[PDB]
Symmetry: C4
Subunit: 385 residues, 4 copies
C-alpha cells in the first residue's frame, strides 16, 4: 500500500545519532567502493544508503583522479544504512553520475543520469525495470538531487537543473507515478538558482531546500502542491546556511550574493516560520557541521537563533548533507519524522591523495534528549595510495 | 505461472543504459572471478548475469593463461545484474565451458557443457537439479549460445553446434520442457554456418541471429515455430554485422565471404523488414560498439540506415554482445522488451597480460529519448600480475 | 507474539559447546572487524552475535591503539552466531561504545551509548528506528550491560551505571516496551557497586549478576519484579567469581574487598540456593575459564563446590563472559535454557601488538552429558601489524 | 512435511557432473577456509556443502600444520553447493572435528563432535538449537560419518565408532527424531570394522557402505530397518573398493586383509546384487577416481564388471568420497536419486606445503547419457605459504 504523505513533520527537540559507516577507515584494508554523493532513503520496511561509486575501490590504482565527478564508470548503488559500501553487500541500481531515489510504499524509484555533458539522460527505474527517460533540455549537464525524492499518495517528486552552475539556469519539478513522468513544470525563477535539492513531504505537499551555486549564501527553496503549483523564495535568516558564506549578520529574502558563489548541498526543515538549519561550522571550507534552530528564521532576518547542536567539529572535514524522512507506515508514528545525513569527504582537493571519497553519518528527529559531539570521518591519510 | 511468449516486440526509438558492473576495475583489488562469455537473462521477478568463470580470481596466479577457452575448472555461475562476479555473491549453476540459461516463468533452466572436445556433454538443470543430458553427436566441441535461451508457453528453445568452426558443421534446435528435451531438429543448411546464437521470443515464435565463423561477414539467422518448423537466411543489409567484416557496401542474402572468416558473437532485432543491428565500430578488431537501425535492412541490400547510436568508442575494447528480453509478466508492459548486453574483453591476445577477462554493460529498449556515449571497461592494464 | 518469560530455568548437568567464531585467526587475512564486548542474544527464530566494532579491520593501520575503549567510531553491529564479524556479513545497529540488545518476541531492541564522557546518551531502537533516549544523569560515563537485556511478557529490562567505576556510583534499572522506557528505578545500594550486568528472565522475574569494580571479589546481584521492585546482595560462595580475586576461602554475603578492585564482566545462574559460576581460571589475570557448580553457594560461605567443567585452559587468554538465554518459543522446551559466551581477548595490554580485539565461544545448558576441554582463541601474535 | 523415504533408488546409466567449487584455486587469493571432510546434503528445497574448517584461511600463517585432524578450532560450517567455502558465505553449524548432517523435510539436523580424544561428545542440533548429546562410550576418539545421515518417515539415522581405528572397535547405529536420539544399537560385528559410513535411504531402509581401516581392502556394509534391526557383510566383488588395496582379483564376503590396513572414506550403491562402486584409480595412494558398475558384484567374487566411467585422472589427487541423495520431495521424481561427491585433497602429506585442504566435485545419477573425463582440483602448489 502506498505511503500517504498527509501527515505533518514530527515536533522535535534535537538530533539523535542514527548511523555511522566508517567506510573510509574500513576501506584502508577492506574492499570498499570509492564513492561520493551518498544519501539515505527509507521504505515502509527498510532504510538504505544510496551512493555514486567511482567503479573502483579505495586504496587501489583505479581510484586515481576520483576527484573528477562525471565518468562512464560512475554507478548508483545501494546498501543497508551504516554498512560500508562494498561490492559484496551493495545492490546495483543504475549507471549514473547524478542520482535520486525514493520508495512510494510499493517499490523503489531510482533516477540515474549518465551520458555526455551536452546531452545527459536520466533513466528512471521502478522496481529495477526502466519505466521512463528524461533527456537534457539545455545541453548543459542535466543533474538532480543527490538525495531522496519525496513521495505523497503514490506520486513521487524530484527537481532537476540543466544549464550553468555559474549563472541563470533552468529548473524543473517532475511528478512521477510508477516511475513514469506524468507532469512537469519549469520554475519561473529569474535571479534564483536551484541545485541539489533536499525535498521532503509535509502535510501532502513537498518542500525543497537547495543550493545556490551562483550568487546565494543563503539557501533557495521551492514548495509545491501535488499539482506542481509552486512557491519560491530564499531562507531569510541571517544565520546563513550555505558554504562558503559570510559571517552571520543581517540576511535576506533573496539571494545574498556576498560569498554565495560556490555552495554545497544542504538541507533545512521548516516549522511554521522557524527553521532547523544544517550547515558547516566553517565559513570558508567544508569543515565541521552543526544543527541550528532559528524560530522566526524562515521569514525573518534575525541573525539570532535559539538552539545549536554540534554534529562535527570545525577541525574535521564534512561535505554534503541532505534530508531524509521516515513515514508513519514504517514508524508507527502519527507524523513524518525528519532525519538528515552528512557526507564526510576525504582526499582531494583538501588533502594530498590521488583520490576522493566520502563516509557518512546520519541523525534522526526525536522529542527526547540528545547531545552534541563530533562524529568525524576518522580515517588517517594519506593511504598506501 | 508460465511466461506466455505470445506478445510482440515493443516499439522502441533508442537504447537506455541499464547496467555496468566495472568488474575488472573492481577486481584490481577485490575478489572478482576472471570470466568471459557473460550474458543477462530475466525471470518474472529478477534479472541475473550468467558467466563462465575460469575457476580463478583476477590478479592472482591462477588467472595465468585464461585465454585458453576450455578446461575442467570452467564453471557457469550467476549473480544479480550490475554486480561484480565474486565468490561471495555468485550462485553456482553448472560445470561448463559453454552455456545457456533461461527462466520459463516457473524456474531456471541452465545448460552447461563440459567434458573432452571429442565427447562433450550438455547437462540441463531445472531449478538446479539435473533433468536431462545431451552428448556431442559429431565429436567436435559440442557448444551452445553463450546467451539466454528463449521461452514461450512453457517451452524453452536453444541452438547447439557440433563440428568445425572452420567449415560446414552440424546445427540443432532443441525444444525443452521442465529441462527435458522433448523434440530436436537438425538444420538442413548447407553453406550456412551457425554459432553462438542470440535467440528471443516474438509473437509465439523464436528468432535467432547468430555468428558465421566460417565465411560470413553478415549474420545468419533461424526463426522457428513451437514445433521446430524453421526458416533460415542471412541478414541482407550492406551494414555488415560481424567482426571482422568489409567496409559497408552492397550486402547479400547469403554468406558474404569477404572477411567473414572469424566472427564474434552478436545479435540483432527484427522489426518487419528492418533490423536493429549491434556491432563493433572497428572492421578488423573487437573495438567500439554501436546500435544501428536499417529499416528495410533485414531483406534489402541497401548499405544505408536511418539511425546510429554510439555505445562504446572505437578507441576502447569490446567483445561479445547478445540479446536478452524482458517479458510482460516482469514488466507490466503489453509487449516483449528487447535489451542487449556487451562483453568488454580485457587482456590477451590484444594486451600484455597473462590473463583474459570481461566486464559487461547492458541497455534496454525504450520508447523515450536516449543518447549515445562511450561506456568502456575502464580498467588500466597491465595488473600487478 | 511476545516472549512469555513465565517459565523457569531448565535443569542442567553441564555445558555443551555451541559456537566458536575464530574471528582473530580468520582476521589475519580476511576482512574482520576489530571488536570487543561481544555478546549473544536470541529471538524466537534466530541467534545473533552483537559486538562493538572499532570502526576498523584486523591487521590494518586503523586498528592502532584499539585498547582505547571509547571513541566516535565505535559502532554496535551484529551477525549470525559463530561467523567472523565482517563488513560483508554484519548488520549495523547503532553508534555506540557501550551497548545492550534483546528480542521481545516481536522485534529487536538495541541500546547504543555514544557521546562525550560527561554527557553520553543511550539511543534505544526498536526494529531499527529510534524509539527513545536516555542521557547521562551523573555526567560520568553512562554505560550499560555489554550483554543481552531480558524480556518478559512484552517488557524488556536493562541496567545502567553512571559515576566512578572507582567508588560509589549510581545504578538504575530500566523497564521498556517497544523500545520506550515506561519506568525506571535507582537502586538504593550504598556500599554496593554494579557494572556490566548479565541479566536473564526466570519465572517472570529478572536476575542480574554483575561486576563490582570498586571493592568486590565476589559478584553483586539484583533481581526484580516486572514492577521494578528489587532485591540486592552479593554471591556468598567462597568460590570467588570475579577477576582479580583471592584464592578460594571463606566468602561473604557482601563485598569482599580483598583483591576486588578491578574486576571483569561475568555471569552466574541461580538455582535455589546453588549457583552455576563462570569464572577465569587465573586469580590475577583474564586467563582460562571454567564452570563451577556450588549448590548451597548463592547463600552460603562454603568454599566448596560439587562440579567443575573446564572451558579454557589457564594457559590461554580469556576475558568477559555473559549469560544469554533461549526461550521456549524458539526452543520448543517447557523451560528457559541458560547459555553463556566467553570473550577471548587478544592484543594489548597483555601482548605486544598495536591493537586489541576478541574472539568468542559459547555453550548451552543441556541435561545430557558433556566434557571439559580448552577452546582458546587460537591466533598467533603479533600480526603483520 | 517430512521426507518419505519409501521410494526406491532411481535406475541410472552413468554420472552427470553436478558441481565443482574450485575452492583451493580461488583460495590462492580469495578468503577461503582451509577445510577437509566436505560433504553434500539436500533438503526438500536446497543442496548445501558441509565441511570441517580449520578455523583458518588458505595462504595464511594460521593454516600451518593443518594436516593435524583434531583441534578446538575445527568447526562444521556449510554453504550452497559449488561455492568456495568462505567466512562471507558460510553458515556456522557446530564446533566439530568430525560431523554429519541431514534434513528430514522440516529442518536440518547437524551432528558435531568436539572435545578430548578420551571423552569426545557429539552435539546434535535441530534447526540450530541443541537437542541432544552423545558422549564417547569407549574413550577413544568418538567419530562419525563425515557425510550425510539418512532420513526416512521423519526419523534420521547415523553411525558412530569409538575405539581403535587399528583393530576391533565399537560401532553404533543411532535413530533420532527432531535431533533427539530415540534408539541406538551396538553392532555385534566381531572381525568387522566400520568407519566413516556413507548411508542412504532406499525403500524405507538405510544402507551404509563404510571404511575398514583395520584389515579390509573391500568395503564393509550395514543395512537396517527403522527399528534398528540390522544386517552386516562386506562387498564381495573382486573389484576392490578401498585404498590402499590389492590389484583386482578374487574378492571375499569378509574382510580382505591384503592391503586393507589404512583405507579411505568411500561409498557404494546397491542395486539388487550389483554395485555402483566409486574408488580411487590408484592402488597405493589417493589418486584418480572412477565409477564402476559390477552387476552380480555385491554378492559375487567376479573381479569382472560391466561399465567404468572416469571421474578424475590417475595423475591427479583425490581423497574421500561419499554418497548423497536427492529425494522426490525436492526432485519431483518417483524415486530417490543417487549422487556422490569427491574430496580433492591438496597439500600434506603428499605435497611440500605447510597446510592441507580440499576441493570438491559432485555428480548425479541420471538415466540419460554421460561421459568420463578428469575434473581435478587444479590448484598449483606450493602457495605463497
Ligand atoms: C555541474 C555543477 C554541479 C553543481 C554546482 O556540480 C556538482 C558539485 C559538486 C561539489 O561541489 O562537491 C560535486 C557534484 N558531483 C557536482 N555535480 C555533477 C553532476 O557533477
Ligand atoms: C570452438 C569454436 C567456438 C566458436 C567459433 O569458439 C568460441 C570463440 C570464442 C571467441 O571468439 O571469442 C570464445 C568461445 N569461448 C569459444 N567457444 C568455445 C566452446 O570454446
Ligand atoms: C568505565 C568503567 C567500565 C566498567 C569498569 O570500564 C569498562 C572496562 C573494560 C575492561 O575492563 O575490559 C572495557 C570496557 N569497554 C569499559 N567500558 C567503557 C564504557 O569504557
Ligand atoms: C581417528 C581414526 C580416523 C579413521 C581411521 O581417522 C580419520 C582418518 C583420516 C584420513 O585417513 O584421511 C582423517 C580424518 N579426519 C580422521 N578422522 C578423525 C576424527 O580424526
Amino acid at each position: 500500500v502506498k505511503l500517504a504523505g498527509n501527515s505533518s513533520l514530527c515536533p522535535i527537540n534535537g538530533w539523535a545519532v542514527y548511523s555511522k559507516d566508517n567506510s573510509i577507515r574500513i576501506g584502508s584494508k577492506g574492499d570498499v567502493f570509492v564513492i561520493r554523493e551518498p544519501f539515505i532513503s527509507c521504505s515502509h520496511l527498510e532504510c538504505r544508503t544510496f551512493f555514486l561509486t567511482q567503479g573502483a575501490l579505495l586504496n587501489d590504482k583505479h581510484s586515481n583522479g576520483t576527484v573528477k565527478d562525471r565518468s562512464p564508470h560512475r554507478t548508483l548503488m545501494s546498501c543497508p544504512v551504516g554498512e560500508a559500501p562494498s561490492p559484496y553487500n551493495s545492490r546495483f541500481e543504475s549507471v549514473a553520475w547524478s542520482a535520486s531515489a525514493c520508495h512510494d510504499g510499493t517499490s523503489w524509484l531510482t533516477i540515474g543520469i549518465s551520458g555526455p555533458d551536452n546531452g545527459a539522460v536520466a533513466v528512471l527505474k521502478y522496481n529495477g525495470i526502466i519505466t521512463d527517460t528524461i533527456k537534457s533540455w539545455r545541453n548543459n549537464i542535466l543533474r538532480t538531487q543527490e538525495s531522496e525524492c519525496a513521495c505523497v499518495n503514490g506520486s513521487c517528486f524530484t527537481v532537476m537543473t540543466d544549464g550553468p552552475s555559474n549563472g541563470q539556469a533552468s529548473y524543473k519539478i517532475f511528478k512521477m507515478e510508477k516511475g513514469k513522468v506524468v507532469k512537469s513544470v519549469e520554475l519561473d525563477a529569474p535571479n534564483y538558482h536551484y541545485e541539489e535539492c533536499s525535498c521532503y513531504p509535509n502535510a501532502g505537499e513537498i518542500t525543497c531546500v537547495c543550493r545556490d551555486s551562483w550568487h546565494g549564501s543563503n539557501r533557495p527553496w521551492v514548495s509545491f502542491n501535488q499539482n506542481l503549483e509552486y512557491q519560491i523564495g530564499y531562507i531569510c535568516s541571517g544565520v546563513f546556511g550555505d558554504n562558503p558564506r559570510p559571517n552571520d549578520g543581517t540576511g535576506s529574502c533573496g539571494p545574498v550574493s556576498s560569498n554565495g558563489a560556490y555552495g554545497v548541498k544542504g538541507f533545512s526543515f521548516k516549522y511554521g516560520n522557524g527553521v532547523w538549519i544544517g550547515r558547516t561550522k566553517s565559513t570558508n571550507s567544508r569543515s565541521g557541521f552543526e544543527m541550528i534552530w532559528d524560530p522566526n528564521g524562515w521569514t525573518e532576518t534575525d541573525s539570532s537563533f535559539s538552539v545549536k547542536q554540534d554534529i562535527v567539529a570545525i577541525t574535521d572535514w564534512s561535505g554534503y548533507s541532505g534530508s531524509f524522512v521516515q513515514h508513519p507506515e514504517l514508524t508507527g508514528l502519527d507524523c513524518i519524522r525528519p532525519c538528515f545525513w552528512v557526507e564526510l569527504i576525504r582526499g582531494r582537493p583538501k588533502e594530498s591523495t590521488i583520490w576522493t571519497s566520502g563516509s557518512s553519518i546520519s541523525f534522526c528527529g526525536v522529542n527526547s534528549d540528545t547531545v552534541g559531539w563530533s562524529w568525524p570521518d576518522g580515517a588517517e591519510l594519506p593511504f598506501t595510495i
